[PDB]
Amino acid sequence: PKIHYRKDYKPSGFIINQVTLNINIHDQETIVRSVLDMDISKHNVGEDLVFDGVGLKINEISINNKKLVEGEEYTYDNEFLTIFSKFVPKSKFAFSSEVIIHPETNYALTGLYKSKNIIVSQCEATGFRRITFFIDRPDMMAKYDVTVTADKEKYPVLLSNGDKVNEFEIPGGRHGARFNDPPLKPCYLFAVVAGDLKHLSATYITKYTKKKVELYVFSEEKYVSKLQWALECLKKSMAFDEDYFGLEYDLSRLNLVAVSDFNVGAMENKGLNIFNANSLLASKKNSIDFSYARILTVVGHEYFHQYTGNRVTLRDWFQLTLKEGLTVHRENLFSEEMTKTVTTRLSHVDLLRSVQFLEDSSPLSHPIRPESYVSMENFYTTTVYDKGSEVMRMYLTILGEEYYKKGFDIYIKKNDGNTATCEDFNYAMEQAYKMKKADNSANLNQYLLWFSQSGTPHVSFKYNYDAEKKQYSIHVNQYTKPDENQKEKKPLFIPISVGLINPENGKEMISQTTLELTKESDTFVFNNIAVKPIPSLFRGFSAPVYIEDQLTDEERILLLKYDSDAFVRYNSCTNIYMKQILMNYNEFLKAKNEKLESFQLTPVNAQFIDAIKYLLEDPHADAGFKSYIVSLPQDRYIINFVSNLDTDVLADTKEYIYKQIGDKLNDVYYKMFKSLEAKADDLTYFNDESHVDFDQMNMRTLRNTLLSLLSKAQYPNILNEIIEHSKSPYPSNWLTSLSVSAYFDKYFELYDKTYKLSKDDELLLQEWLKTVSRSDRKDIYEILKKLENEVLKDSKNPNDIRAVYLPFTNNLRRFHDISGKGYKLIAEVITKTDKFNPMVATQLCEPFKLWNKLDTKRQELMLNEMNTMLQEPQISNNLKEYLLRLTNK
Ligand SMILES: O=C(N[C@@H](C(=O)NO)c1ccc(-c2cc(F)c(F)c(F)c2)cc1)C1CCCCC1
Ligand SMILES: [Mg+2]
Ligand SMILES: [Mg+2]
Ligand SMILES: [Mg+2]
Ligand SMILES: [Zn+2]
């Protein structure tokens, strides 16, 4: 198994200048003819010409129109085509080939494949070599001239990159289109689509050059009424890059295309972005609320790649975070501006500190720029994406908006049209840093450690106040735990956005201040501080770290009520909950271990409960924020703080704490549930797809959160509310009615009702599957068996399989059944999936990522299933590599 090392990068001995393709789609096969106009590079040392080419059937290959013969002049082993150097020309030459591929049976969804009745490609990272021979690496930039031919009735719409320059008829009911794309690009940005596509379109006029851009959004005919919001999002994305970054789209046309079968969310192929239908299509009757932020995020993300990834591309795959971390950061800026809700940033943080922090303390921990890989398909991680985003966001925090924008533009202007590395970005940022500091000696060399050092830093605090001196000090320490990547961890450049709150009136005591912690510890002193403050630390979550605020719960409550920063308010709440969780967890654990007949539990802080009530009852407070404060921290966040976590004991702990709070606040919850109804469920704009109200969707989130709390609580006659909720036109509401009815005898009545509402829309049915999967049912295993037999069957659609199984894996009490039966079930699904889609099989391993954090019995049970999966004779490269790393072999 070949290991690629970052330090081993070297330019190719060859150059590919022009790609001319003919892709002829037929019923049982697709024939790909390719002529590569090539040259010898300055780095060439007379080596064999080796092309990537995976699973290609060779019809013929030639050099300069002379047919090559197998054995004598080349070898092919289904992975590499080797042309022996004595047969490789010493100057410019043409290499040509004709191969046969089979998209109909390509269930791995990489390369060229068939998704229902649409032919579609996915080439990132190294999928182009599944279509034709190539030196398949992103520094091999070339011009593309692409002809696609197909049956006209089945495939009337033909798309590839660049301008459509010809369309023609072919005998026998066939037709062709030629696409010429003169600007250089890496092969992972090649795409082709063929199908009976329907569309919406619009014309966008750019801000400065006033170029007309044609925008097209495509789907299968059945779902063409779900395209409107995507088109609106694309317009919004274009405006935001213009307005914030001064960047205009450079091409005549941009196509977005939804397909049903897709391994991830979407892909930024130049001028031809291809989407998982679940991240492009929605309508108010047939989509839950989360679809709208999703589509906004994913359309924006792919659009922002046109600069950060497409126009400035990657030297090599170890630079992945340079385009993905930066594009997630650009998408987050965009979505924060579009939604105007604080819950947008909080949701990002919530995901990072649960999913990505778990990854970074697991055996899979890696820096955002890894030193090696075996599988590229395993490289696309929350570390590279989401910690990468936070590392890209810290530059903005450090520089401020004006100098950040200046540094970003330096980056774009210097590297436009070229490959680039992480150093190129740090360099641009450093030039702005020198400007901001008015100091040509300032540098960001330490900052590069964010790219190379793995693990989550821990930042802790001590405080001191001298009332006579009016002098306040914040002593700060950072620590990263050693791991398999670095034995000795170095201090990072950590920006700490801080405020100082006057506890008597809740007001700010200093101006905006970002502490630059660059040592293992430092002491920051403030003069003329008139009263002892409560510090507001890491405002906006200003670094991707574990924060240990060393505040009392009284101080945390004061911040929760009166601080100006949404994240510190949310974090102060989080920290109050975590202190309670850890305390009750240990009390339950001791009672379990000692077999106690009687014991005591520490009650929830009553002033905390009063504070929650205070915020809930404040009309001027934000509904999305309110839904967070009544929610305990994510299980995957909690597990980072507990060794040998007994999931039953954690389930008992959560249940006690929710019951404590509900016993005081349920009447408040119910009153709000009823009073929110009019605004939350307003139907005024239900048949307008252009009109999206993120505050209103947050009101529904709050209403559905409260209803869940009230249902679990068996609040008197709440089932009446549940039944009425099932009649709401909004899927977020009527699917919520199904999941909260789990606690009542009406569950299967609502199961059938909502199934009937869901079954005729592909994406809605997947949302219904998730709702069932996540239902808090004692008979959930029997229910999953019913989904398998009656709905899922042998679907190879990743959306179907992920919907049925992933939500269930978050069922703390049942997935982690001490028998190991949940582990056994997901491992069977992983092995089954691995036969046809290794990338999705590795996604389905997600619940095993925390295996060594659980109690000893469940560690053993998980490890047994992983070892069983590893012993499968037909295990894929992807899955084997992943499980070997996860189990520390
Ligand atoms: O879809 C996602 N990411 C893709 C991306 O960055 N789009 O711009 C993404 C695209 C392609 C791949 C990918 C797909 C493959 F089939 C494959 F083999 C591969 F190696 C990578 C992984 C992630 C996300 C994370 C960004 C927002 C949507 C969910
Ligand atoms: Mg093949
Ligand atoms: Mg404008
Ligand atoms: Mg289907
Ligand atoms: Zn991306």
From Swiss-Prot:
May have an additional translation initiation. Translation initiation at the first Met codon would generate a form that contains the signal peptide, enters the endomembrane system, and ultimately reaches the food vacuole. Initiation of translation at an internal Met codon would result in a form that lacks the signal peptide, thereby re-directing the protein to the cytosol. A nuclear localization signal would then lead to nuclear import. This is Aminopeptidase N. Binds 1 zinc ion per subunit. Also, can use Mn(2+), Mg(2+) and Co(2+) with less efficiency. A peptide binds at E124, G265, A266, E268. It is found in: Cytoplasm. Displays aminopeptidase activity with a broad substrate specificity. Preferentially, cleaves after Leu and Met, but also cleaves after Ala and Arg. Low activity towards Lys, Phe, Tyr, Trp, Gln, Ser and Gly and negligible activity towards Glu, Asp, Pro, Ile, Thr, Val, His and Asn. Has dipeptidase activity. Plays a role in the terminal stages of host hemoglobin digestion by cleaving the N-terminal residue of small hemoglobin-derived oligopeptides. Its EC number is 3.4.11.-. GO terms for biological process: proteolysis. It comes from the Eukaryota. The gene is M1AAP. The active site is at E302 (proton acceptor). GO terms for molecular function: aminopeptidase activity; dipeptidase activity; metalloaminopeptidase activity; zinc ion binding.
